[PDB]
Enzyme design. Structure first.
Site, PDB file in Angstrom:
ATOM      1  N   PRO A  94       0.821  -1.216   0.000  1.00  0.00           N
ATOM      2  CA  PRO A  94       0.000   0.000   0.000  1.00  0.00           C
ATOM      3  C   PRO A  94       0.856   1.267   0.000  1.00  0.00           C
ATOM      4  O   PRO A  94       2.089   1.189   0.022  1.00  0.00           O
ATOM      5  CB  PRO A  94      -0.745  -0.114   1.314  1.00  0.00           C
ATOM      6  CG  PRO A  94       0.348  -0.626   2.200  1.00  0.00           C
ATOM      7  CD  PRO A  94       0.955  -1.777   1.355  1.00  0.00           C
ATOM      8  N   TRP A  95       0.216   2.425  -0.027  1.00  0.00           N
ATOM      9  CA  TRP A  95       0.982   3.658  -0.093  1.00  0.00           C
ATOM     10  C   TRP A  95       1.219   4.329   1.272  1.00  0.00           C
ATOM     11  O   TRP A  95       1.972   5.284   1.350  1.00  0.00           O
ATOM     12  CB  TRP A  95       0.320   4.627  -1.074  1.00  0.00           C
ATOM     13  CG  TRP A  95      -1.153   4.747  -0.864  1.00  0.00           C
ATOM     14  CD1 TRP A  95      -2.148   4.236  -1.657  1.00  0.00           C
ATOM     15  CD2 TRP A  95      -1.812   5.412   0.232  1.00  0.00           C
ATOM     16  NE1 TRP A  95      -3.375   4.548  -1.115  1.00  0.00           N
ATOM     17  CE2 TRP A  95      -3.198   5.271   0.037  1.00  0.00           C
ATOM     18  CE3 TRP A  95      -1.362   6.121   1.358  1.00  0.00           C
ATOM     19  CZ2 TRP A  95      -4.134   5.824   0.904  1.00  0.00           C
ATOM     20  CZ3 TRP A  95      -2.300   6.662   2.227  1.00  0.00           C
ATOM     21  CH2 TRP A  95      -3.668   6.503   1.996  1.00  0.00           C
ATOM     22  N   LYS A 152       5.047  -5.500  -6.049  1.00  0.00           N
ATOM     23  CA  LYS A 152       4.511  -4.342  -6.730  1.00  0.00           C
ATOM     24  C   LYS A 152       4.160  -3.313  -5.679  1.00  0.00           C
ATOM     25  O   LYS A 152       3.250  -3.534  -4.905  1.00  0.00           O
ATOM     26  CB  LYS A 152       3.241  -4.746  -7.452  1.00  0.00           C
ATOM     27  CG  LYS A 152       3.085  -4.157  -8.797  1.00  0.00           C
ATOM     28  CD  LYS A 152       2.303  -2.890  -8.763  1.00  0.00           C
ATOM     29  CE  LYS A 152       0.832  -3.133  -8.566  1.00  0.00           C
ATOM     30  NZ  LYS A 152       0.299  -1.960  -7.816  1.00  0.00           N
ATOM     31  N   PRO A 153       4.871  -2.192  -5.640  1.00  0.00           N
ATOM     32  CA  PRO A 153       4.547  -1.103  -4.705  1.00  0.00           C
ATOM     33  C   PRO A 153       3.318  -0.366  -5.228  1.00  0.00           C
ATOM     34  O   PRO A 153       2.909  -0.618  -6.341  1.00  0.00           O
ATOM     35  CB  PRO A 153       5.765  -0.187  -4.825  1.00  0.00           C
ATOM     36  CG  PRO A 153       6.163  -0.387  -6.288  1.00  0.00           C
ATOM     37  CD  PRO A 153       6.047  -1.883  -6.477  1.00  0.00           C
ATOM     38  N   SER A 154       2.720   0.507  -4.426  1.00  0.00           N
ATOM     39  CA  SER A 154       1.613   1.331  -4.891  1.00  0.00           C
ATOM     40  C   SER A 154       2.110   2.263  -6.006  1.00  0.00           C
ATOM     41  O   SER A 154       3.269   2.693  -5.982  1.00  0.00           O
ATOM     42  CB  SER A 154       1.102   2.184  -3.737  1.00  0.00           C
ATOM     43  OG  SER A 154       0.189   3.164  -4.201  1.00  0.00           O
ATOM     44  N   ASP A 173      -3.127  -6.579 -11.878  1.00  0.00           N
ATOM     45  CA  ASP A 173      -4.005  -7.641 -12.371  1.00  0.00           C
ATOM     46  C   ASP A 173      -3.277  -8.768 -13.096  1.00  0.00           C
ATOM     47  O   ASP A 173      -3.477  -9.918 -12.771  1.00  0.00           O
ATOM     48  CB  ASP A 173      -5.130  -7.096 -13.264  1.00  0.00           C
ATOM     49  CG  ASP A 173      -6.273  -6.512 -12.456  1.00  0.00           C
ATOM     50  OD1 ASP A 173      -6.173  -6.500 -11.202  1.00  0.00           O
ATOM     51  OD2 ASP A 173      -7.300  -6.039 -12.983  1.00  0.00           O
ATOM     52  N   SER A 232      -7.270  -1.761   0.529  1.00  0.00           N
ATOM     53  CA  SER A 232      -8.665  -1.513   0.882  1.00  0.00           C
ATOM     54  C   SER A 232      -9.503  -2.775   0.765  1.00  0.00           C
ATOM     55  O   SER A 232      -9.126  -3.738   0.088  1.00  0.00           O
ATOM     56  CB  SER A 232      -9.245  -0.422  -0.028  1.00  0.00           C
ATOM     57  OG  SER A 232      -9.237  -0.864  -1.372  1.00  0.00           O
ATOM     58  N   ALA A 288     -12.224  -3.035  -0.833  1.00  0.00           N
ATOM     59  CA  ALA A 288     -12.619  -3.163  -2.231  1.00  0.00           C
ATOM     60  C   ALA A 288     -11.543  -3.875  -3.046  1.00  0.00           C
ATOM     61  O   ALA A 288     -11.826  -4.729  -3.899  1.00  0.00           O
ATOM     62  CB  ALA A 288     -12.897  -1.767  -2.812  1.00  0.00           C
ATOM     63  N   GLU A 336      -4.608  -7.959   4.545  1.00  0.00           N
ATOM     64  CA  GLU A 336      -4.791  -6.996   5.614  1.00  0.00           C
ATOM     65  C   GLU A 336      -5.517  -5.812   4.970  1.00  0.00           C
ATOM     66  O   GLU A 336      -4.920  -5.056   4.215  1.00  0.00           O
ATOM     67  CB  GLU A 336      -3.411  -6.634   6.143  1.00  0.00           C
ATOM     68  CG  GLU A 336      -3.363  -6.331   7.637  1.00  0.00           C
ATOM     69  CD  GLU A 336      -3.590  -4.859   7.909  1.00  0.00           C
ATOM     70  OE1 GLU A 336      -4.788  -4.467   7.797  1.00  0.00           O
ATOM     71  OE2 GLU A 336      -2.578  -4.121   8.209  1.00  0.00           O
ATOM     72  N   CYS A 361      -3.758   1.689   9.547  1.00  0.00           N
ATOM     73  CA  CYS A 361      -4.826   0.725   9.774  1.00  0.00           C
ATOM     74  C   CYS A 361      -5.137   0.501  11.268  1.00  0.00           C
ATOM     75  O   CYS A 361      -6.210   0.010  11.608  1.00  0.00           O
ATOM     76  CB  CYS A 361      -4.487  -0.587   9.074  1.00  0.00           C
ATOM     77  SG  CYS A 361      -4.603  -0.397   7.262  1.00  0.00           S
ATOM     78  N   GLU A 402     -14.286   3.174   7.823  1.00  0.00           N
ATOM     79  CA  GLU A 402     -12.933   3.703   7.917  1.00  0.00           C
ATOM     80  C   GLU A 402     -12.786   5.029   7.142  1.00  0.00           C
ATOM     81  O   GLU A 402     -13.285   5.157   6.008  1.00  0.00           O
ATOM     82  CB  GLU A 402     -11.921   2.666   7.401  1.00  0.00           C
ATOM     83  CG  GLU A 402     -10.469   2.936   7.784  1.00  0.00           C
ATOM     84  CD  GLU A 402      -9.492   1.973   7.097  1.00  0.00           C
ATOM     85  OE1 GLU A 402      -9.826   1.490   6.006  1.00  0.00           O
ATOM     86  OE2 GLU A 402      -8.389   1.695   7.639  1.00  0.00           O
TER      87      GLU A 402
HETATM   88 CA   LIG Z   1      -9.962  -2.645  13.506  1.00  0.00          CA
END
Ligand SMILES: [Ca+2]
Ligand SMILES: [Ca+2]
Ligand SMILES: [Ca+2]
Ligand SMILES: [Ca+2]
Lengths: 474, 474, 474, 474
Positions: C147-148, C172-174, C209, C225, C227, C246, C280, C378
């Site tokens: 993630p970023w 693969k980084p963000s 992908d 996320s 999603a 996560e 998070c 969130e």
């Molecule tokens: Ca929590």
């Protein structure tokens, strides 16, 4: 009363000198039992060693099944076991039946399950081109010596893990309290193959010594006094025998000014006097913070004074007798020595009961100092001492300044303090805001002169195996 | 030339009597070193005990960081350490540097990682309304006694786990081989807080006994003889100290008719004679099936006969001398006893070498029977014996009929037999189609008179902690 | 800045479309970087797959040594890494350097150690005549998507355990924050064999992908996320890939009437706003008992109002900007929705900063109800809400009625209450009287829509292996 | 007889459409059973969710006792269960009774024990001033979907660990084989608290989908086809549900020139055809080294041709019928496909049996090549194929070039080879010189498209908990 020994799958009369077994509530002899002769001690060990060839190779599943059957047999005979223990030890019958029997059955069921759950390191190639694996194999013949305070329970703590691990066992109960072990001998005769379990009877000098000193014995497991522990270690030194001991305790009970005093009192009234204080985890050494010290002493004194002593078979009896005349005399002596100190006050009790049997009054002593014998030395009787303390750092250092290391409790409502103190105490167990609670899955065992090795839990099982590394070049 | 003791973060001269350290390859004195006085032994234990208050409370991360720093220091000084050990012990320099140094560095790096990976039982409510957890805390002060065969390596095996566990350590190397330990004292002085590591020097009677008998010592770790093991156990009995013991071995090497004989020979030429056979896992006791017996003996004899002895600093040297004049005499005696038997043949060697130093010829003895002394008792020299056997059941029972239980190997091409025999051998380690290979992650330790407790692996770390149960009523 | 991909041990330019990378403190472009083409993604996975043949067979010791080297390289380049992260993410440089860099180095050192300490079940005969052992082998190629919010930290959390376990990785980084990963690519190029570590760059649709959907990928590890998590699971369904996820959190912070309010305030001022709340485990959802509710809100409001926003490279800056314009928009929306509720009060903040970059004012909202969107969803910004509660049972049920399950804290001085609540919270982590503290040895991971799998600890390592049973009939 | 669902402690008729259950040995309908309505599926999950409040907080001891009672009930009703399974599945009655029943009873007894033996990390201070502990808590409601090949056994593998871990369960048997599960529903009604165990009946689309997609379901455990696995993963993606999956196998059987051919033959005659090959570990894909290829084919052909098909209640019956008309047609198609290849020979069988029921002749196919469908795709019928191979490296790479990863066996007398191959196979289980043997303590589960997660062993129990970190600042 069963009075025969179990040797190699048969029930046989001891061939040694007869010994009396007493009912400590009345001081009367229950019966005379012939102890094992030297030749029978030897035959028991040889039978166990011969049976190890096959038993040590059984699967965990098979051993688990034998343990489950043994648990069922004890459960089915709960009343009779409770009655025998009550008569032999003076324990209130309701306590023996409601508390001890279910705990004993559970120890065998727990270890039946644990026998099949042994951990290890992952197998694999730690050196290029070689596969390594770790096993846990049994040792061989284990000699177990049980104490007199919880004869059947301690027999279970020693039998269950040893057998679960695949060892054969030769069990020697205390000469003072063999009745439940000899009943067990009768009932368990056919559950395990011949020689896998053997049960003897007799004194330390005549039966225990030849047993623990036998060349085929690989491990000696003992619950008893520091003196006895020292003797066994010195006696087995010549053959480097593995040893497992639990030698006594003097559990510190640390009570901070923010503790629930009513709960401490209600607790200690039980935990300092259960089994007449003949328990290695008895809540016997109280350190009470200056702020609540006098309130605690006063309320605890009133609560301890109501403890009811009477016939073990009476449901109203809370406090039974001490185990023998000798033990009664030693407890009395420790109390008088505390009094000769000049600065210790008897809040309640402090005297033997008038009448038959070995009853001692429930006793509370106050004003004991860190360096007094009553604080430094185990009494193992219905006696609790209270010492005032100033601060946390001071009391943790006093509690840790002890030869004992088995169990402890801390009483405080503060989260930080509870965890700080629990982290630092040099005791195998620390309860917070309670005391005296044991479960089959959690280990019980000491540090320092309290000994080493664990009873109950997977660690108790591990103690009876040897870890082995097998490495295959490929 | 380092000769000072490490006590409480300072390098100080011993205040006891001077003691000579010899170069076994020449029989000349390397130097005289003052041993620790009684007061210094006491000061080392007191400094360790005082340092434990803080050290015992450090996080695994911090301890692991200290261990990695020590590993780096040893690695950086590898050549120096290898030279000292070769001078003090007579080991071929190339072997000390290429084999021992990397292994030693790895022990410290392994335990740095293991310190942070300790297992336990899941925390939770095993009794309604009470949360239980399991911790693994340090014991306190550990006294470690290292042997003379692999002085630095054995010092590493005792220091690394003890420190990783959070204990303070007082280490005593053998009076015969203190050089590497005293160099380590110099190099390691500032890596750990003062008093966390202490290194003494002296004889068993003068320094070892006062050390292991000290009231603040909680555990004694020893690698040495069975006789020393019995002495230590007897000596520490009065205070129930925890002990950890590796006492010697007589590794059975079981060769079946289907083994790769060429591999067995190439193997034993190394494993039976490395470090002049002064290795508790030396491939010294060969049981060879009747089909391959004569072939194995003739080929092994010719291979053993080419082992080259010479100056330890010469790259061609394969076999160094024995550790001392006394040990050389004992080895010589065992061989002569084997010969007086009348049925053992010397295939090659069997004599001390002419010249200075304590050299003994690489020796192979054939025709030794199960009950002969050469088979039942450790020689710890460049001596291998071969005994013929008929079948698998017979030989496993022979191998298991021993007072030793450290290590073993089986050589066979058959999958079934390899597993069957490995499963049944009563030895801490069993190699298949190889011998002598150890890795930091796999445990090494014995059974029976070989002792108990493990070196290396997570089990080696666990041996230096006490398991504690904390239970919170809620 | 480094801008090249690491594929099969070579640094190569991306062959896809150029993409802008922004400095969130100024809103200006740091640079345009060519993303990986379709063919480069495929080549990276094929290289990892080919490297696995040998890498998957290495010993733990060898892999551990590579991880220690990688830790050393990051440590030696700490400053450069901190500066890149600060420029790419807007994090206060002093925080990146003093907090993040040492934790990152530690993750690698921890996993180097853990690689050699894998547990398993004891090998032995569970079925008569058959020896069973348990191994832990690697899976193969792992695709990792970072993630970023903590680009380098998250990259470490995914690389370290996967490699320690013996897998090959394509990372693969963000698209938003690739700078530290591409610098890592440069520095780490020669530490592992070619193809064992590969680092790509690009957007989810064009690079992520095709990567996660590659037939040779065996596991996909994602922090992102909900999603995105859902999308990846649906995308990998056809090949039953293992996943590790996560996905977000909404840590409840439960404050009882007996909590130390000053500590809660001081705590939340940091934990609710560090990294601008883009964490998070941010302390974003406070449940405050009615007794202390008004007091807490007022004091927290005053404390949050003093947070200093300014240039990331200024030592006095405590609060940086949000990561992107789009994320700034989303945060503002959520606050406006809370306001349109009619019952939520803005205690402080609640607006975007005027000026350049993506700054949002540190915000405290009070009067939020259990069912409001601000409590249930969130925000991942510098926004904290406070909800009043009546009693323990009620609030534990409120906190457990959530789609999230990553972390939580409970603040109370009462021992009993702290353990009762900790025991019942359905969250991967529960802190008592603190929040936000992570260590390499303890697992971090969620339940429910927060995902599954652990980062850090031995459990994090186990997730990257497959347990295997090998059983030899003998 | 029994046809009612178990929902919240009550036995109730299904409210959905009636569905026929067939006796595969005759092709006749045993009965029509109403499936669960959508409302009943929702009521089952809600009941499980409400029961979890109390069940999820029970002690391991309490749960273990419930599991032991369920084991006892199954054992007592062994014959009834065996007869139902035989009538519903066509399995030879003697096999169902002598093999399956004891194994099912043992699964429950094993997990009763394992529930009390969960491991964790040691609790302690990993960060100065903070005590950390690790718990293993249950997830909540578990949806279990059992396959038709071993209805009761698979039901047990799903129920036992989930319950032991403290979860509540909603179980759905296959629509084709519900009889044993519904009998179990009757027998188990009063063993666990209401709603802790629920048993439904119906088709995948009408009952299984609403169940696995329910918002309160936290984990879905499936044994079934890869197609069903893909669908379930897609179906639960939107809520990030945990999944546990066993999706099929194609076990390679690698036979080297030095194997005991007669043992291979006797083995495969059983393992390739037991349960009519409807077993995910069936010995169906044989790789035979060029040297013994023709001998093995001939001998196996002769042995497979004597397999006796007949009435399931006939003690001489070795091979029962396939599970359904549709499965029988699918198997027949796969065989015809192999024959249309032009290079595969039918050694024996290869046709449906004349008469009533779904019987297919025991079949052996020779000359199959690595890339043929008969080698790459599971048939799940009484069909075994044999492919020649040249060398070890080649065959390991062929075996590992598969979408399957559940089980495997290697047959060779050579120690080296056995371990090399076992180390390299990418399969959850590898047997050496046997096949098909499972024990409750050792894990069973796949990799690649065979799925992930384990059945049996402590790992199977762990899969149904979430690891939690509780950290107390102190
Ligand atoms: Ca929590
Ligand atoms: Ca104690
Ligand atoms: Ca040995
Ligand atoms: Ca398979």
């Amino acid at each position: 009363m069963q009075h025969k020994l179990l040797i190699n799958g048969e029930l046989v009369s001891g061939e040694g000198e007869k010994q009396p077994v007493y009912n400590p509530a009345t001081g009367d002899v229950l019966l005379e039992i012939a102890e094992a002769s030297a030749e029978q001690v030897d035959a028991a060990v040889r039978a166990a060693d011969a049976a190890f060839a096959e038993w040590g190779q059984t699967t965990p599943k098979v051993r688990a099944e034998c343990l489950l059957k043994l648990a069922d047999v004890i459960e089915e005979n709960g009343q009779v076991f409770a009655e025998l223990e009550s008569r032999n030890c003076g324990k209130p019958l309701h306590s023996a039946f409601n508390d001890e029997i279910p705990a004993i059955v559970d120890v065998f069921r727990f270890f039946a399950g644990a026998a099949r759950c042994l951990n290890g390191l992952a197998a694999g190639e730690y050196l290029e081109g070689h596969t390594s694996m770790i096993r846990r194999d049994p040792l061989g013949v284990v000699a177990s010596i049980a104490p007199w305070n919880y004869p059947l329970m301690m027999a279970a703590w020693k039998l269950a893990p040893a057998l679960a691990a695949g060892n054969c066992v030769v069990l020697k109960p205390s000469e003072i309290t063999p009745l439940t072990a000899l009943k067990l001998a009768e009932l368990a005769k056919d559950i395990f193959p011949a020689g896998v379990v053997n049960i003897l009877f007799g004194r330390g000098k005549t039966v225990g010594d030849p047993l623990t000193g036998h060349p085929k014995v690989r491990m000696v497991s003992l619950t008893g006094s520091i003196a006895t522990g020292e003797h066994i270690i010195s006696h087995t030194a010549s053959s480097i025998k593995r040893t497992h001991m639990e030698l006594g305790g003097k559990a510190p009970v640390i009570v901070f000014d923010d503790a629930d005093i009513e709960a401490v009192v209600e607790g200690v009234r039980t935990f300092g006097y259960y089994n007449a204080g003949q328990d290695c985890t008895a809540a016997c050494r109280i350190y009470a913070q200056k702020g609540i010290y006098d309130t605690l002493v006063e309320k605890l004194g009133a609560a301890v004074a109501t403890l009811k002593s009477g016939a073990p078979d009476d449901e109203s009896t809370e406090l039974g007798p001490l185990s023998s005349l000798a033990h009664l005399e030693r407890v009395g002596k420790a109390v008088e020595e505390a009094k000769a100190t000049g600065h210790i006050k008897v809040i309640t009790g402090g005297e033997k009961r008038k009448g038959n049997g070995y009853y001692y009054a429930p006793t509370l002593l106050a004003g004991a100092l860190q360096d007094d014998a009553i604080v430094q030395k185990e009494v193992f009787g219905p006696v609790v001492s209270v010492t005032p303390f100033d601060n946390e750092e001071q009391v943790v250092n006093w509690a840790n300044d002890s030869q004992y290391g088995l169990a402890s409790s801390v009483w405080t409502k503060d989260v930080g303090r509870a965890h700080r103190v629990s982290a630092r105490l040099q005791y195998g167990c620390t309860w917070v805001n309670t005391h005296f609670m044991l479960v089959s899955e959690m280990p019980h065992g000491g540090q320092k002169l309290s000994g080493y090795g664990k009873d109950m839990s997977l660690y108790g099982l591990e103690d009876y195996t040897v870890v082995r590394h097998v490495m295959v070049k490929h």
